[PDB]
Amino acid sequence: AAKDVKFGNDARVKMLRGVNVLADAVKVTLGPKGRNVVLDKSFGAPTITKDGVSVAREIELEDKFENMGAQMVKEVASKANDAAGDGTTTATVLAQAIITEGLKAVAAGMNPMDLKRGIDKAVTAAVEELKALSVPCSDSKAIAQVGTISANSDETVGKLIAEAMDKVGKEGVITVEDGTGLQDELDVVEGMQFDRGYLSPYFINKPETGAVELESPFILLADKKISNIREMLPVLEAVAKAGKPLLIIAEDVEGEALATLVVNTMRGIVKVAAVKAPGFGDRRKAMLQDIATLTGGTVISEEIGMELEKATLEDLGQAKRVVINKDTTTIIDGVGEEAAIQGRVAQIRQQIEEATSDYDREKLQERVAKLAGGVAVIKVGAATEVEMKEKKARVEDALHATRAAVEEGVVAGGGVALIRVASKLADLRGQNEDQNVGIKVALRAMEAPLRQIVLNCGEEPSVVANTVKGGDGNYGYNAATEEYGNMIDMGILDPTKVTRSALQYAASVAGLMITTECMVTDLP
Protein backbone atom coordinates (compact mmCIF):
# COMPACT_ATOMS: atom_id res chain seq x y z
CA ALA A 1 0.00 0.00 0.00
CA ALA A 2 0.89 3.64 -0.49
CA LYS A 3 2.92 4.82 2.49
CA ASP A 4 3.17 7.93 4.63
CA VAL A 5 6.72 8.83 5.62
CA LYS A 6 7.61 11.31 8.30
CA PHE A 7 11.00 12.66 9.28
CA GLY A 8 12.63 14.16 12.34
CA ASN A 9 10.74 16.11 14.93
CA ASP A 10 7.33 15.54 13.38
CA ALA A 11 7.77 11.80 13.37
CA ARG A 12 9.35 11.85 16.84
CA VAL A 13 6.54 13.88 18.41
CA LYS A 14 3.84 11.63 16.98
CA MET A 15 5.88 8.68 18.18
CA LEU A 16 6.00 10.22 21.62
CA ARG A 17 2.34 11.02 21.93
CA GLY A 18 1.93 7.39 21.07
CA VAL A 19 4.24 6.28 23.85
CA ASN A 20 2.63 8.59 26.40
CA VAL A 21 -0.85 7.29 25.75
CA LEU A 22 0.32 3.75 26.37
CA ALA A 23 2.57 4.77 29.23
CA ASP A 24 0.02 6.98 30.98
CA ALA A 25 -2.53 4.20 30.76
CA VAL A 26 -0.16 1.81 32.51
CA LYS A 27 1.26 4.20 35.15
CA VAL A 28 -2.01 4.56 37.00
CA THR A 29 -1.42 1.01 38.25
CA LEU A 30 1.86 1.39 40.01
CA GLY A 31 2.45 0.54 43.65
CA PRO A 32 0.19 -0.07 46.70
CA LYS A 33 -1.72 3.10 45.87
CA GLY A 34 -1.88 1.80 42.29
CA ARG A 35 -5.33 2.03 40.69
CA ASN A 36 -7.11 -0.19 38.19
CA VAL A 37 -7.91 -0.01 34.50
CA VAL A 38 -10.75 -1.59 32.54
CA LEU A 39 -10.16 -3.46 29.35
CA ASP A 40 -13.33 -3.79 27.33
CA LYS A 41 -14.12 -7.12 25.69
CA SER A 42 -16.71 -7.90 23.01
CA PHE A 43 -16.09 -11.40 24.30
CA GLY A 44 -17.76 -11.34 27.71
CA ALA A 45 -17.65 -8.73 30.46
CA PRO A 46 -14.99 -6.06 30.71
CA THR A 47 -11.78 -6.83 32.52
CA ILE A 48 -10.44 -4.96 35.53
CA THR A 49 -6.74 -5.40 36.13
CA LYS A 50 -3.74 -3.65 37.64
CA ASP A 51 -1.33 -5.79 35.60
CA GLY A 52 0.73 -3.42 33.43
CA VAL A 53 1.46 -5.86 30.62
CA SER A 54 -2.25 -6.82 30.50
CA VAL A 55 -2.99 -3.22 29.73
CA ALA A 56 -0.15 -2.56 27.29
CA ARG A 57 -1.39 -5.26 24.97
CA GLU A 58 -4.84 -3.71 24.65
CA ILE A 59 -3.48 -0.32 23.54
CA GLU A 60 -3.63 0.50 19.83
CA LEU A 61 -3.83 4.00 18.37
CA GLU A 62 -5.73 5.39 15.44
CA ASP A 63 -2.85 7.66 14.41
CA LYS A 64 -0.61 5.35 12.46
CA PHE A 65 2.49 7.01 13.88
CA GLU A 66 1.31 7.64 17.38
CA ASN A 67 0.42 3.95 17.14
CA MET A 68 3.87 2.79 16.01
CA GLY A 69 5.47 4.49 19.05
CA ALA A 70 3.04 2.71 21.30
CA GLN A 71 3.54 -0.55 19.49
CA MET A 72 7.19 -0.23 20.32
CA VAL A 73 7.28 0.67 23.97
CA LYS A 74 4.66 -2.07 24.29
CA GLU A 75 7.38 -4.69 23.92
CA VAL A 76 9.30 -3.63 27.01
CA ALA A 77 6.24 -4.04 29.13
CA SER A 78 6.01 -7.35 27.29
CA LYS A 79 9.54 -8.81 27.42
CA ALA A 80 9.66 -7.79 31.07
CA ASN A 81 6.82 -10.26 31.57
CA ASP A 82 8.43 -13.17 29.72
CA ALA A 83 11.54 -12.60 31.77
CA ALA A 84 10.15 -12.67 35.30
CA GLY A 85 6.40 -12.23 35.16
CA ASP A 86 6.38 -8.92 37.16
CA GLY A 87 7.87 -5.42 37.19
CA THR A 88 6.08 -4.85 33.89
CA THR A 89 4.41 -1.60 34.90
CA THR A 90 7.60 -0.38 36.48
CA ALA A 91 9.72 -1.19 33.40
CA THR A 92 7.35 0.81 31.22
CA VAL A 93 7.67 3.80 33.52
CA LEU A 94 11.40 3.89 32.94
CA ALA A 95 11.12 3.81 29.11
CA GLN A 96 8.50 6.54 29.06
CA ALA A 97 11.06 8.36 31.22
CA ILE A 98 14.20 7.59 29.18
CA ILE A 99 12.53 8.41 25.91
CA THR A 100 11.10 11.74 27.05
CA GLU A 101 14.40 13.03 28.19
CA GLY A 102 16.23 11.44 25.33
CA LEU A 103 14.18 13.07 22.66
CA LYS A 104 14.42 16.37 24.47
CA ALA A 105 18.18 15.97 24.12
CA VAL A 106 18.01 15.06 20.50
CA ALA A 107 15.90 18.15 20.15
CA ALA A 108 18.74 19.71 22.11
CA GLY A 109 20.79 18.99 19.00
CA MET A 110 22.82 16.04 20.18
CA ASN A 111 23.81 13.02 18.21
CA PRO A 112 21.22 10.42 19.16
CA MET A 113 23.56 7.54 18.57
CA ASP A 114 25.85 8.69 21.41
CA LEU A 115 22.91 9.43 23.60
CA LYS A 116 22.14 5.78 23.08
CA ARG A 117 25.61 4.59 24.01
CA GLY A 118 25.69 6.92 27.01
CA ILE A 119 22.50 5.30 28.14
CA ASP A 120 23.63 1.77 27.36
CA LYS A 121 26.82 2.21 29.28
CA ALA A 122 25.07 3.98 32.16
CA VAL A 123 22.87 0.87 32.31
CA THR A 124 25.56 -1.82 32.15
CA ALA A 125 26.96 0.02 35.09
CA ALA A 126 23.71 0.23 36.96
CA VAL A 127 23.39 -3.51 36.58
CA GLU A 128 26.57 -4.47 38.33
CA GLU A 129 25.42 -1.98 40.92
CA LEU A 130 22.30 -3.96 41.60
CA LYS A 131 24.06 -7.30 41.58
CA ALA A 132 26.07 -5.69 44.34
CA LEU A 133 23.16 -4.83 46.60
CA SER A 134 21.34 -7.99 45.71
CA VAL A 135 21.32 -9.99 48.91
CA PRO A 136 20.10 -13.57 49.27
CA CYS A 137 16.44 -14.14 49.94
CA SER A 138 16.34 -17.53 51.62
CA ASP A 139 14.29 -17.55 54.80
CA SER A 140 10.55 -18.17 54.60
CA LYS A 141 9.95 -14.74 56.11
CA ALA A 142 11.64 -12.85 53.28
CA ILE A 143 9.92 -15.04 50.74
CA ALA A 144 6.50 -14.16 52.09
CA GLN A 145 7.55 -10.52 52.01
CA VAL A 146 8.09 -10.43 48.29
CA GLY A 147 5.02 -12.48 47.73
CA THR A 148 3.03 -10.03 49.77
CA ILE A 149 4.63 -6.93 48.27
CA SER A 150 4.12 -8.38 44.78
CA ALA A 151 0.44 -9.17 45.41
CA ASN A 152 -0.26 -5.42 46.05
CA SER A 153 0.50 -5.81 49.75
CA ASP A 154 -1.45 -8.97 50.57
CA GLU A 155 0.25 -10.90 53.35
CA THR A 156 -2.14 -13.85 53.05
CA VAL A 157 -0.50 -14.35 49.69
CA GLY A 158 3.18 -14.07 50.53
CA LYS A 159 2.18 -16.08 53.57
CA LEU A 160 0.62 -18.85 51.56
CA ILE A 161 3.34 -18.90 48.92
CA ALA A 162 6.02 -18.87 51.56
CA GLU A 163 4.47 -22.04 52.94
CA ALA A 164 4.13 -23.89 49.66
CA MET A 165 7.74 -23.17 48.79
CA ASP A 166 8.57 -24.31 52.31
CA LYS A 167 6.86 -27.60 51.55
CA VAL A 168 7.25 -28.75 47.94
CA GLY A 169 10.87 -27.70 48.36
CA LYS A 170 13.03 -25.85 45.85
CA GLU A 171 12.18 -27.93 42.80
CA GLY A 172 8.63 -28.63 43.91
CA VAL A 173 5.96 -27.39 41.53
CA ILE A 174 3.38 -24.75 42.36
CA THR A 175 0.22 -23.69 40.45
CA VAL A 176 -2.82 -21.50 40.95
CA GLU A 177 -6.39 -22.36 39.95
CA ASP A 178 -9.73 -20.78 40.73
CA GLY A 179 -10.91 -22.03 44.11
CA THR A 180 -14.42 -23.16 44.93
CA GLY A 181 -15.24 -21.03 47.98
CA LEU A 182 -14.16 -17.46 48.66
CA GLN A 183 -11.20 -18.45 50.83
CA ASP A 184 -7.81 -19.08 49.28
CA GLU A 185 -6.82 -22.70 49.77
CA LEU A 186 -3.58 -24.63 49.61
CA ASP A 187 -3.41 -28.29 48.61
CA VAL A 188 -0.14 -30.26 48.62
CA VAL A 189 0.33 -33.56 46.85
CA GLU A 190 2.56 -36.11 48.52
CA GLY A 191 4.61 -38.69 46.64
CA MET A 192 3.89 -40.00 43.14
CA GLN A 193 0.60 -39.27 41.39
CA PHE A 194 -0.98 -38.31 38.07
CA ASP A 195 -4.30 -37.69 36.33
CA ARG A 196 -5.64 -41.13 35.39
CA GLY A 197 -8.68 -42.84 36.88
CA TYR A 198 -9.64 -46.50 36.89
CA LEU A 199 -11.25 -48.13 33.82
CA SER A 200 -12.50 -50.88 36.10
CA PRO A 201 -14.88 -48.86 38.30
CA TYR A 202 -16.15 -52.11 39.80
CA PHE A 203 -12.65 -52.49 41.22
CA ILE A 204 -13.17 -49.98 44.05
CA ASN A 205 -11.20 -51.09 47.10
CA LYS A 206 -12.32 -49.52 50.41
CA PRO A 207 -13.68 -45.92 50.34
CA GLU A 208 -16.33 -44.62 47.91
CA THR A 209 -15.71 -42.04 45.14
CA GLY A 210 -14.10 -45.08 43.52
CA ALA A 211 -11.41 -45.33 46.21
CA VAL A 212 -8.95 -48.12 45.53
CA GLU A 213 -6.27 -49.09 48.01
CA LEU A 214 -4.35 -52.14 46.87
CA GLU A 215 -2.37 -53.05 50.00
CA SER A 216 1.26 -53.92 49.15
CA PRO A 217 0.59 -54.41 45.38
CA PHE A 218 2.79 -55.35 42.45
CA ILE A 219 2.99 -52.60 39.87
CA LEU A 220 2.83 -53.46 36.20
CA LEU A 221 3.99 -51.30 33.26
CA ALA A 222 3.43 -51.95 29.54
CA ASP A 223 3.38 -50.45 26.04
CA LYS A 224 0.02 -51.54 24.57
CA LYS A 225 -3.74 -51.99 24.91
CA ILE A 226 -5.26 -55.27 26.15
CA SER A 227 -8.56 -56.06 24.43
CA ASN A 228 -8.31 -59.80 23.80
CA ILE A 229 -4.52 -59.84 24.33
CA ARG A 230 -5.62 -61.08 27.77
CA GLU A 231 -2.82 -63.59 27.33
CA MET A 232 -0.48 -63.01 30.28
CA LEU A 233 -2.08 -65.12 33.02
CA PRO A 234 1.31 -66.56 33.95
CA VAL A 235 2.14 -63.09 35.15
CA LEU A 236 -1.35 -62.76 36.56
CA GLU A 237 -1.58 -66.12 38.28
CA ALA A 238 2.02 -65.48 39.39
CA VAL A 239 0.66 -62.94 41.87
CA ALA A 240 -2.58 -64.86 42.43
CA LYS A 241 0.01 -67.16 44.00
CA ALA A 242 1.79 -64.52 46.09
CA GLY A 243 -1.73 -63.39 46.98
CA LYS A 244 -0.91 -59.73 46.43
CA PRO A 245 -3.04 -56.93 44.85
CA LEU A 246 -2.04 -55.60 41.46
CA LEU A 247 -1.78 -52.25 39.71
CA ILE A 248 -1.33 -51.89 35.96
CA ILE A 249 -0.15 -49.21 33.52
CA ALA A 250 -0.11 -49.09 29.69
CA GLU A 251 -1.76 -47.80 26.51
CA ASP A 252 -5.16 -49.12 27.60
CA VAL A 253 -7.41 -52.03 28.62
CA GLU A 254 -10.60 -53.54 27.09
CA GLY A 255 -13.44 -55.17 28.98
CA GLU A 256 -12.38 -58.66 27.86
CA ALA A 257 -9.57 -58.11 30.35
CA LEU A 258 -11.59 -56.04 32.80
CA ALA A 259 -14.70 -58.23 32.76
CA THR A 260 -12.71 -61.31 33.79
CA LEU A 261 -10.45 -59.16 35.98
CA VAL A 262 -13.62 -58.03 37.76
CA VAL A 263 -14.89 -61.39 39.04
CA ASN A 264 -11.31 -62.48 39.80
CA THR A 265 -10.75 -59.59 42.19
CA MET A 266 -14.37 -60.26 43.25
CA ARG A 267 -14.19 -63.98 43.97
CA GLY A 268 -11.10 -63.05 45.99
CA ILE A 269 -8.92 -64.68 43.33
CA VAL A 270 -6.75 -61.60 42.76
CA LYS A 271 -7.57 -58.09 44.02
CA VAL A 272 -6.59 -55.97 41.05
CA ALA A 273 -7.57 -53.11 38.75
CA ALA A 274 -5.82 -50.84 36.26
CA VAL A 275 -5.58 -47.28 34.93
CA LYS A 276 -4.13 -45.84 31.73
CA ALA A 277 -0.69 -44.21 31.75
CA PRO A 278 -0.15 -40.42 31.32
CA GLY A 279 -1.12 -39.28 27.81
CA PHE A 280 0.61 -39.15 24.40
CA GLY A 281 2.97 -41.83 23.04
CA ASP A 282 6.35 -40.21 23.78
CA ARG A 283 4.76 -38.66 26.83
CA ARG A 284 3.43 -41.67 28.78
CA LYS A 285 6.26 -43.95 27.74
CA ALA A 286 8.69 -41.20 28.77
CA MET A 287 7.11 -41.48 32.19
CA LEU A 288 7.23 -45.10 33.34
CA GLN A 289 10.84 -46.21 33.79
CA ASP A 290 10.73 -43.56 36.49
CA ILE A 291 7.65 -45.24 37.91
CA ALA A 292 9.15 -48.71 37.45
CA THR A 293 12.57 -47.83 38.79
CA LEU A 294 10.74 -46.15 41.67
CA THR A 295 8.76 -49.18 42.83
CA GLY A 296 11.57 -51.37 41.50
CA GLY A 297 9.68 -52.46 38.43
CA THR A 298 10.71 -53.55 34.96
CA VAL A 299 8.82 -51.61 32.27
CA ILE A 300 7.77 -53.86 29.42
CA SER A 301 9.58 -53.00 26.23
CA GLU A 302 6.64 -54.27 24.22
CA GLU A 303 8.53 -52.62 21.34
CA ILE A 304 11.97 -54.01 22.24
CA GLY A 305 13.27 -57.25 23.84
CA MET A 306 10.02 -58.14 25.64
CA GLU A 307 6.44 -59.34 25.11
CA LEU A 308 3.21 -59.83 27.05
CA GLU A 309 3.58 -62.81 29.46
CA LYS A 310 7.25 -62.46 28.59
CA ALA A 311 8.01 -61.14 32.09
CA THR A 312 8.27 -62.67 35.59
CA LEU A 313 6.39 -61.58 38.72
CA GLU A 314 9.67 -60.20 40.03
CA ASP A 315 9.74 -57.65 37.20
CA LEU A 316 6.77 -56.02 38.88
CA GLY A 317 7.36 -53.02 41.08
CA GLN A 318 6.19 -52.91 44.69
CA ALA A 319 4.65 -50.11 46.74
CA LYS A 320 3.03 -49.72 50.17
CA ARG A 321 -0.36 -49.30 48.52
CA VAL A 322 -2.23 -47.07 46.06
CA VAL A 323 -5.12 -44.62 45.84
CA ILE A 324 -7.38 -44.37 42.81
CA ASN A 325 -10.75 -42.78 41.98
CA LYS A 326 -12.41 -42.20 38.60
CA ASP A 327 -9.80 -39.57 37.72
CA THR A 328 -6.50 -39.96 39.60
CA THR A 329 -3.97 -42.52 40.75
CA THR A 330 -1.37 -42.37 43.48
CA ILE A 331 1.32 -44.67 44.80
CA ILE A 332 1.88 -44.55 48.55
CA ASP A 333 5.53 -45.51 48.07
CA GLY A 334 7.27 -47.77 45.62
CA VAL A 335 10.17 -49.32 47.49
CA GLY A 336 12.93 -48.23 45.14
CA GLU A 337 16.47 -47.51 46.27
CA GLU A 338 17.71 -43.91 46.29
CA ALA A 339 20.75 -45.01 44.29
CA ALA A 340 17.96 -45.39 41.75
CA ILE A 341 15.95 -42.30 42.77
CA GLN A 342 18.66 -39.60 42.64
CA GLY A 343 19.98 -41.58 39.66
CA ARG A 344 16.81 -41.18 37.61
CA VAL A 345 17.08 -37.63 38.93
CA ALA A 346 20.72 -36.92 38.15
CA GLN A 347 19.97 -37.79 34.53
CA ILE A 348 17.29 -35.07 34.61
CA ARG A 349 20.04 -32.48 34.94
CA GLN A 350 20.63 -32.37 31.19
CA GLN A 351 16.88 -32.26 30.59
CA ILE A 352 16.80 -29.29 32.99
CA GLU A 353 19.42 -26.93 31.51
CA GLU A 354 17.73 -26.92 28.11
CA ALA A 355 17.62 -24.49 25.20
CA THR A 356 13.83 -25.10 25.01
CA SER A 357 13.23 -23.71 28.51
CA ASP A 358 9.59 -22.72 28.08
CA TYR A 359 7.19 -25.70 28.03
CA ASP A 360 10.25 -27.97 28.29
CA ARG A 361 11.57 -27.38 31.82
CA GLU A 362 7.89 -27.05 32.78
CA LYS A 363 6.34 -30.46 32.41
CA LEU A 364 9.94 -31.52 33.09
CA GLN A 365 10.54 -30.39 36.69
CA GLU A 366 7.00 -31.59 37.22
CA ARG A 367 8.07 -35.25 37.18
CA VAL A 368 11.27 -34.14 38.87
CA ALA A 369 9.11 -32.85 41.71
CA LYS A 370 7.05 -36.02 41.65
CA LEU A 371 10.18 -38.19 41.54
CA ALA A 372 11.16 -37.09 45.07
CA GLY A 373 9.73 -33.66 45.87
CA GLY A 374 6.17 -32.43 46.14
CA VAL A 375 3.51 -30.76 44.07
CA ALA A 376 1.41 -27.84 45.24
CA VAL A 377 -1.69 -26.02 44.04
CA ILE A 378 -3.35 -22.84 45.17
CA LYS A 379 -7.03 -22.08 44.89
CA VAL A 380 -7.92 -18.40 44.82
CA GLY A 381 -10.92 -17.04 46.69
CA ALA A 382 -13.37 -14.62 45.10
CA ALA A 383 -17.08 -13.82 45.22
CA THR A 384 -17.35 -12.64 41.65
CA GLU A 385 -15.58 -13.71 38.52
CA VAL A 386 -14.16 -10.28 37.75
CA GLU A 387 -12.58 -10.66 41.18
CA MET A 388 -11.36 -14.24 40.87
CA LYS A 389 -9.33 -13.10 37.86
CA GLU A 390 -7.51 -10.03 39.21
CA LYS A 391 -6.90 -11.95 42.46
CA LYS A 392 -5.59 -15.13 40.83
CA ALA A 393 -3.58 -12.88 38.54
CA ARG A 394 -1.52 -11.05 41.13
CA VAL A 395 -1.17 -14.39 42.93
CA GLU A 396 0.85 -15.65 40.01
CA ASP A 397 2.99 -12.52 39.76
CA ALA A 398 4.06 -13.13 43.30
CA LEU A 399 4.43 -16.81 42.62
CA HIS A 400 6.89 -15.70 39.96
CA ALA A 401 8.59 -12.91 41.87
CA THR A 402 9.45 -15.31 44.73
CA ARG A 403 10.82 -17.77 42.17
CA ALA A 404 13.09 -14.90 41.10
CA ALA A 405 14.14 -13.52 44.47
CA VAL A 406 15.27 -17.01 45.42
CA GLU A 407 17.38 -17.49 42.33
CA GLU A 408 18.57 -13.90 42.09
CA GLY A 409 18.14 -12.35 45.51
CA VAL A 410 16.45 -9.04 46.31
CA VAL A 411 16.98 -5.35 46.87
CA ALA A 412 15.09 -2.40 48.30
CA GLY A 413 11.65 -1.62 46.87
CA GLY A 414 9.91 1.73 46.37
CA GLY A 415 12.29 2.16 43.46
CA VAL A 416 14.93 3.12 46.02
CA ALA A 417 17.48 0.61 44.75
CA LEU A 418 17.58 2.40 41.39
CA ILE A 419 17.48 5.88 42.79
CA ARG A 420 20.30 4.63 44.96
CA VAL A 421 22.50 3.09 42.29
CA ALA A 422 21.87 6.28 40.36
CA SER A 423 23.79 8.36 42.87
CA LYS A 424 26.50 5.74 42.69
CA LEU A 425 27.11 6.51 39.00
CA ALA A 426 27.18 10.27 39.49
CA ASP A 427 30.69 10.21 38.05
CA LEU A 428 30.19 7.88 35.15
CA ARG A 429 31.38 9.37 31.88
CA GLY A 430 31.77 8.29 28.28
CA GLN A 431 33.78 8.94 25.11
CA ASN A 432 32.28 12.35 24.34
CA GLU A 433 29.84 14.92 25.68
CA ASP A 434 26.63 13.75 24.01
CA GLN A 435 27.33 10.38 25.61
CA ASN A 436 27.65 11.93 29.06
CA VAL A 437 24.25 13.47 28.65
CA GLY A 438 23.09 10.10 27.38
CA ILE A 439 24.25 8.71 30.67
CA LYS A 440 22.85 11.56 32.77
CA VAL A 441 19.61 11.10 30.96
CA ALA A 442 19.38 7.49 32.05
CA LEU A 443 20.32 8.10 35.66
CA ARG A 444 17.75 10.88 35.79
CA ALA A 445 15.07 8.43 34.56
CA MET A 446 15.77 5.94 37.36
CA GLU A 447 13.82 8.18 39.71
CA ALA A 448 10.75 7.41 37.61
CA PRO A 449 9.52 4.36 39.45
CA LEU A 450 9.79 6.02 42.77
CA ARG A 451 8.08 9.24 41.95
CA GLN A 452 5.30 7.66 39.94
CA ILE A 453 4.55 5.66 43.00
CA VAL A 454 4.45 8.85 45.01
CA LEU A 455 2.34 10.62 42.50
CA ASN A 456 -0.12 7.68 42.67
CA CYS A 457 -0.46 8.82 46.29
CA GLY A 458 -1.35 12.37 45.44
CA GLU A 459 1.93 13.57 46.91
CA GLU A 460 4.96 15.59 45.81
CA PRO A 461 7.05 13.12 43.73
CA SER A 462 9.95 15.55 43.77
CA VAL A 463 9.69 16.27 47.50
CA VAL A 464 9.76 12.67 48.55
CA ALA A 465 12.42 11.81 46.00
CA ASN A 466 14.61 14.50 47.60
CA THR A 467 14.32 13.39 51.19
CA VAL A 468 14.80 9.86 49.91
CA LYS A 469 17.90 10.86 48.01
CA GLY A 470 19.11 12.68 51.11
CA GLY A 471 19.11 9.30 52.85
CA ASP A 472 21.52 6.39 52.55
CA GLY A 473 21.44 2.66 52.06
CA ASN A 474 17.85 1.42 52.32
CA TYR A 475 16.33 4.59 53.64
CA GLY A 476 13.11 4.85 51.69
CA TYR A 477 9.63 6.31 51.65
CA ASN A 478 6.81 3.97 52.53
CA ALA A 479 3.90 5.04 50.36
CA ALA A 480 1.55 2.80 52.25
CA THR A 481 2.38 4.14 55.68
CA GLU A 482 3.28 7.53 54.26
CA GLU A 483 6.52 7.57 56.25
CA TYR A 484 10.20 6.99 55.57
CA GLY A 485 12.57 4.37 56.98
CA ASN A 486 14.36 1.15 56.10
CA MET A 487 12.70 -0.47 53.12
CA ILE A 488 13.99 -3.94 54.02
CA ASP A 489 13.06 -3.92 57.68
CA MET A 490 9.68 -2.87 56.41
CA GLY A 491 9.60 -5.91 54.17
CA ILE A 492 9.28 -3.86 51.00
CA LEU A 493 11.49 -6.11 48.79
CA ASP A 494 11.83 -6.31 45.00
CA PRO A 495 13.33 -9.53 43.58
CA THR A 496 16.65 -8.22 42.32
CA LYS A 497 16.13 -9.93 38.93
CA VAL A 498 12.95 -8.02 38.08
CA THR A 499 14.37 -4.67 38.94
CA ARG A 500 17.25 -5.54 36.62
CA SER A 501 15.21 -6.85 33.72
CA ALA A 502 12.90 -3.81 33.97
CA LEU A 503 15.82 -1.47 33.59
CA GLN A 504 17.43 -3.50 30.79
CA TYR A 505 14.43 -4.23 28.65
CA ALA A 506 13.31 -0.65 29.15
CA ALA A 507 16.57 0.83 27.97
CA SER A 508 17.02 -1.71 25.20
CA VAL A 509 14.07 -0.23 23.33
CA ALA A 510 13.97 3.33 24.65
CA GLY A 511 17.52 3.66 23.45
CA LEU A 512 16.72 2.69 19.88
CA MET A 513 13.48 4.53 19.85
CA ILE A 514 15.17 7.85 20.49
CA THR A 515 17.28 7.31 17.36
CA THR A 516 14.38 7.57 15.00
CA GLU A 517 14.77 10.17 12.26
CA CYS A 518 12.19 8.76 9.85
CA MET A 519 9.11 6.57 10.01
CA VAL A 520 7.16 4.79 7.34
CA THR A 521 3.65 3.33 7.51
CA ASP A 522 0.39 3.15 5.59
CA LEU A 523 -1.96 5.97 4.75
CA PRO A 524 -5.03 6.80 6.89
* Annotated binding residue 486: no
Residue 66 in contact with Mg ion, rule: CB under 5 A: no
Residue 478 in contact with ligand ADP, rule: CB under 6 A: yes
Q: Are 324 and 198 in contact (CB under 8 A)?
A: yes
Q: What residue 208 binds from ligand ADP, a copy of itself, Mg ion, none (CB within 5 to 8 A, per partner kind)?
A: a copy of itself
List the interface residues with Mg ion, window 136-195 (CB under 5 A): 150
Residue 86 in contact with Mg ion, rule: CB under 5 A: yes
Residue 383 in contact with a copy of itself, rule: CB under 8 A: yes
Site string for ligand ADP, 32-61 (x = CB under 6 A): x-x-----------------x---------
Q: According to CB under 8 A, which one of 170, 206, 228, 304 is a site residue for a copy of itself?
A: 304
Pairing status of strand 322-324 against strand 185-190: unpaired
Residue 471 in contact with ligand ADP, rule: CB under 6 A: no
Q: Which amino acid is at 62?
A: E
Q: Cα-flanking dihedrals φ and ψ of residue 440, to 5°?
A: -45, -40
3-state secondary structure string, 261-287? Answer: HHHHHHHCCCCEEEECCCCCHHHHHHC
Pairing status of strand 475-478 against strand 518-519: unpaired
Site for Mg ion (CB under 5 A): how many residues? 2
In the complex, minimum distance from the CB of residue 392 to ligand ADP, in angstroms, rounded to a whole number: 15
Q: According to CB under 8 A, which one of 107, 132, 242, 263 is a site residue for a copy of itself?
A: 263
| Alpha helices (H) along 151-288 | 155-168, 233-242, 255-267, 281-286
Q: According to CB under 8 A, which one of 16, 23, 68, 399 is a site residue for a copy of itself?
A: 68
Residues 6+ apart with CB under 8 A from 335: 295, 296, 318, 319, 320
Q: What angle do CA 239, 242, 248 make, to 5 degrees?
A: 30
> Beta-carbon neighbour count of residue 494 at 10 Å?
30
Q: Distance between CA 249 and CA 292 in Å, rounded?
A: 10
Q: What residue 13 binds from Mg ion, ligand ADP, a copy of itself, none (CB within 5 to 8 A, per partner kind)?
A: none
In the complex, minimum distance from the CB of residue 111 to Mg ion, in angstroms, rounded to a whole number: 18
Q: What residue 453 binds from a copy of itself, Mg ion, ligand ADP, none (CB within 5 to 8 A, per partner kind)?
A: ligand ADP
Residue 377 in contact with ligand ADP, rule: CB under 6 A: no
Q: Which of 486, 481, 477, 488 shows the shortest CA–CA distance to 452?
A: 477
* Annotated binding residue 234: no
Q: What residue 172 binds from a copy of itself, ligand ADP, Mg ion, none (CB within 5 to 8 A, per partner kind)?
A: none
Q: Distance between CA 106 and CA 10 in Å, rounded?
A: 13
Residue 5 in contact with a copy of itself, rule: CB under 8 A: yes
* Annotated binding residue 205: no
How many C-alpha atoms does 264 have within 13 Å on its Cβ side?
21
> Given the complex with Mg ion, which of 26 and 291 has the nearer CB atom?
26
Q: According to CB under 8 A, which one of 386, 444, 461, 475 is a site residue for a copy of itself?
A: 386
Q: Distance between CA 519 and CA 394 in Å, rounded?
A: 37
* Annotated binding residue 88: yes
Residue 61 in contact with a copy of itself, rule: CB under 8 A: yes
Q: Which of 405, 41, 381, 492 shows the shortest CA–CA distance to 49?
A: 41
* Annotated binding residue 50: yes
Residues 6+ apart with CB under 8 A from 36: 28, 29, 48, 49, 50, 390
Q: According to CB under 8 A, which one of 170, 206, 228, 350 is a site residue for a copy of itself?
A: 350
Residue 60 in contact with a copy of itself, rule: CB under 8 A: yes
Site for a copy of itself (CB under 8 A): how many residues? 87
In the complex, minimum distance from the CB of residue 333 to ligand ADP, in angstroms, rounded to a whole number: 42
> Given the complex with ligand ADP, which of 103 and 502 has the nearer CB atom?
502
* Annotated binding residue 313: no
| Alpha helices (H) along 360-410 | 360-370, 385-408
* Annotated binding residue 436: no
Q: According to CB under 6 A, which one of 313, 453, 506, 507 is a site residue for ligand ADP?
A: 453
Q: What residue 149 binds from Mg ion, a copy of itself, ligand ADP, none (CB within 5 to 8 A, per partner kind)?
A: ligand ADP
The full length of the chain comes to 524
Q: Which stretch binds a copy of itself (CB under 8 A): 2-10, 213-221, 223-231, 464-472?
A: 2-10
Q: What residue 30 binds from ligand ADP, a copy of itself, Mg ion, none (CB within 5 to 8 A, per partner kind)?
A: ligand ADP
Q: Are 257 and 328 in contact (CB under 8 A)?
A: no
Long-range contacts from 144-149, C-beta under 8 angstroms, 24+ separation: 145/491, 145/492, 145/493, 146/398, 146/401, 146/402, 146/405, 146/410, 146/493, 146/494, 146/495, 147/398, 147/399, 147/401, 147/402, 148/398, 148/491, 149/413, 149/491, 149/492, 149/493, 149/494
In the complex, minimum distance from the CB of residue 399 to ligand ADP, in angstroms, rounded to a whole number: 13
Which residues make beta-bridge pairs with 475?
486
Q: Distance between CA 426 and CA 129 in Å, rounded?
A: 12
Q: According to CB under 8 A, which one of 86, 101, 315, 390 is a site residue for a copy of itself?
A: 390
Annotated binding site for ATP: 29-32, 50, 86-90, 414, 478-480, 494
- Which residues in this chain contact Mg ion in the complex, by CB under 5 A? 86, 150
- Which residues in this chain contact ligand ADP in the complex, by CB under 6 A? 29-32, 34, 52, 86-90, 149, 153, 413-415, 453, 478-480, 492, 494
